[PDB]
Subunit: 81 residues, 4 copies
């Protein structure tokens, strides 16, 4: 009479986030890289920096998705664990 | 001679990224719907209510930043499929 | 033991899983469109071009992705009928 | 000209794939360990089996999309340009 894997579907959603976070971080750094190699370019330099910014927010929103799943998994395995 | 393509591969890489955001947006609208419903099948007390509430708010930002991501990727290729630099 | 079936009240079994299947449904539909694109640029392409090979090297794997995603959906779905929604 | 934006877009598909493969790898390993749960051949061990093995198919599939993209980006240093 024990829940089987139990804290499993929330374990792997946490993993999915860590690796989505570090991914778009790498993507972010590579957009800024690209932006820098462009100098007084055309209407691509400003489109990229928007895309860069969009990535920063996507990273913030995923970090708080993570913190919840993270902080929540410390909750349900509170007392009696 | 000239072979005026080169951009061949980047119309491609932008279209597929556009497709991706369009289906992510619609996918997350469902997740938001689902979330609002389990909220409603929950107590006014239960802590997991507050968790769900937040994951819904985070889902409201996500959809919004993916609308913005979409518009962008559009713009980049969108009109400026017009030989810029 | 045998009190009424309030499993439908407050549980993250209906949840967590539910979300994963919604994820798969829409990845399946996304990749179908993506493959349709690849079918299309393979139609408008050359038959001797360098891109026909890469494009004709991307559809392929989207076909297998679509198949492996359809199977993932049956599984997670089977894991749905099995627990709550006990086949009715 | 204008090939900076193109090396960018391929690179962004490439970075997205490295991390999808890496993420899908972590999920297999963690599904390799947990699938030897605790002998007690329970029901949901059947489900973890299928899940894990569709991870292998995902990984091998991403690994192919990414070599191509990598091979494609490679079409730039030397040969072309």
């Amino acid at each position: 009479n024990n829940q089987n894997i139990t804290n499993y579907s929330i374990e792997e959603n946490i993993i999915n986030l860590k690796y989505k976070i570090r991914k778009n971080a790498v993507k972010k750094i590579n957009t800024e890289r690209e932006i820098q190699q462009l100098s007084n370019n055309d209407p691509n330099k400003n489109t990229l920096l928007a895309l860069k910014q969009n990535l920063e927010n996507l990273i913030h929103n995923q970090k708080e998705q993570l913190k919840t799943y993270q902080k929540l998994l410390k909750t349900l395995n509170d007392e009696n664990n």
